[PDB]
Design a protein around this ligand. Structure first.
Ligand SMILES: COc1cccc(-c2cccc3c2O[C@H](CNC(=O)c2ccc(OCCN(C)C)cc2)CO3)n1
Ligand SMILES: Nc1nc2c(ncn2[C@@H]2O[C@H](COP(=O)(O)OP(=O)(O)NP(=O)(O)O)[C@@H](O)[C@H]2O)c(=O)[nH]1
Ligand SMILES: [Mg+2]
Length: 167
């Protein structure tokens, strides 16, 4: 079956691990254990093609490393995640897109913008703002909650569909 290498990126605390663990294990993690680098694997069927998702879950709180750039170079597509209750994480998205475009050395990298924590009442980033940012990058936007499971499959499966279009 076909293999897709997906990297989940974004600011500390936005829910990159919670999203991934919700996808793999059908489990919400309540505790906040910061990530350095963790990898996961899942077989799924998307649009009738059976495929193997290799998912790399990154750190938020991370300076420069040559190691960070190796795994971003091998990654075929990226979930750029922010939290809808944290405007700074949304502003940081543009930094992640630049970091990616630099290491891949391309304008046209498969990406999906993910607004996580949509279950929380303390919304500070508007759906319309995030849609406009996504439209400006020519990429999809998906609102998710690792807690309710809303959008989780959609986020990963949409990224795979983006990788297919690109090749
Ligand atoms: C066995 O394959 C798996 C399993 C789970 C996740 C991933 C995965 C997902 C997203 C991005 C990834 C991934 O692993 C890739 C392979 N793993 C690596 O650890 C890796 C090995 C060598 C690298 O250098 C690249 C070229 N040259 C120096 C050898 C770089 C990385 C790294 O990027 N791959
Ligand atoms: N209410 C709510 N909480 C969430 C959601 N997603 C993650 N969280 C919470 O946010 C905290 C951070 O989750 P985590 O997955 O650790 O975020 P992260 O981006 O992996 N952090 P890091 O980059 O430091 O590894 C956790 O306590 C978790 O319960 C969500 O959709 N809703
Ligand atoms: Mg994490």
């Amino acid at each position: 079956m076909t293999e897709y290498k997906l990297v989940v990126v974004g600011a500390g605390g936005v829910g990159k691990s919670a999203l991934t663990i919700q996808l793999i294990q059908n489990h919400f993690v309540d505790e906040y254990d910061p990530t350095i680098e963790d990898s996961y694997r899942k077989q799924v069927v998307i649009d009738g093609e059976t495929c193997l998702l290799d998912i790399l879950d990154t750190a938020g709180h991370e300076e420069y490393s040559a190691m960070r750039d190796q795994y971003m170079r091998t990654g075929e597509g990226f979930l750029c995640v922010f939290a809808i209750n944290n405007t700074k994480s949304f502003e940081d998205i543009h930094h992640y897109r630049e970091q990616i475009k630099r290491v891949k050395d391309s304008e046209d990298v498969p990406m999906v913008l993910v607004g996580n924590k949509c279950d929380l009442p303390s919304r500070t980033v508007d759906t319309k703002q995030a849609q406009d940012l996504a439209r400006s990058y020519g990429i999809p936007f998906i609102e998710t909650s690792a807690k309710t499971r809303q959008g989780v499959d959609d986020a990963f499966y949409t990224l795979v569909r983006e990788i297919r279009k690109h090749k």
